[PDB]
Design a protein around this ligand. Structure first.
Ligand SMILES: CC(C)(O)CNC(=O)C[C@H]1CN(S(=O)(=O)c2ccc(F)cc2)c2ccc(C(O)(C(F)(F)F)C(F)(F)F)cc2S1
Length: 228
């Protein structure tokens, strides 16, 4: 593949991400000043775990839909067989949602954008998953320190999704080729933007798979979601 074909793959993945990012980065950074009051926080803490799970399940479903629309816009992904398209999405959609979350996370005050405003992890107290919520805040904190650009997120999440090691793949060689092309695109873009430094600072593939397992496991006990 030529240097123009790799630059086209970068451009494309970044466009596909811009078109499916849910909220613009600009709107998220602007809304950082819009923080929940102590009474609003109290309002969430008092809700039943069932009410909180119902709400969060709806927001997670809405987030997963944007991830599905992102994968569908990656020309290579659409050429794969339905067994492989299902395997990649089921194994990677939640990992992509977890990576995308760092954009709505503010490291200054350790808050997250939730239902129109920013709030801390105490907002999620009714769920009874303090360790699971802490894990999300810690992961978003370490990813936010990198100053992850929209294009870096686009290329990195395409790689989270297009992974040939996912057990259950029929056409493994087809997935390997798509993954190899995206790695070149990712490596080339980092060189062009002088952001080679972030590669070693990114989470190991295993760290992200383990985090996601915890979240999928707790999800089972509150529905039968599209990530379940
Ligand atoms: C803002 C964008 C466009 O960049 C990205 N979109 C999002 O942030 C998607 C969120 C959707 N929600 S959420 O809004 O309810 C939420 C938001 C922040 C959190 F710290 C936790 C939940 C969700 C629900 C359960 C969960 C869980 O991980 C959680 F309950 F938090 F443990 C679960 F899967 F275990 F249930 C995750 C999310 S992530």
């Amino acid at each position: 593949a030529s240097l123009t074909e790799i630059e086209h793959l970068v451009q494309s993945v970044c466009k596909s991400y811009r078109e499916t990012c849910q909220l613009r980065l600009e709107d998220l950074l602007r809304q950082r000043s819009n923080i929940f009051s102590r009474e609003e926080v109290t309002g969430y803490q008092r809700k039943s775990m069932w009410e909180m799970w119902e709400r969060c399940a709806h927001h997670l479903t809405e987030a997963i839909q944007y991830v599905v629309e992102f994968a569908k816009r990656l020309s290579g992904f659409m050429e794969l067989c339905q067994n492989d398209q299902i395997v990649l999405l089921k194994a990677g959609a939640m990992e992509v949602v977890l990576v995308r979350m760092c954009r709505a996370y503010n490291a200054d005050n350790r808050t997250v954008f939730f239902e129109g405003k920013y709030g801390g992890m105490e907002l999620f107290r009714a769920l009874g998953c303090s360790e699971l919520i802490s894990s999300i805040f810690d992961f978003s904190h370490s990813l936010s320190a990198l100053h992850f650009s929209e294009d870096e997120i686009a290329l990195y999440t395409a790689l989270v999704l297009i992974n040939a090691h996912r057990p259950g793949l029929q056409e493994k060689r087809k997935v390997e080729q798509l993954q190899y092309n995206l790695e070149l695109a990712f490596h080339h873009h980092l060189c062009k933007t002088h952001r080679q430094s972030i590669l070693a600072k990114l989470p190991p593939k295993g760290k992200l798979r383990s985090l996601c397992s915890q979240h999928v496991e707790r999800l089972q006990i509150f529905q039968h979601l599209h990530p379940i």
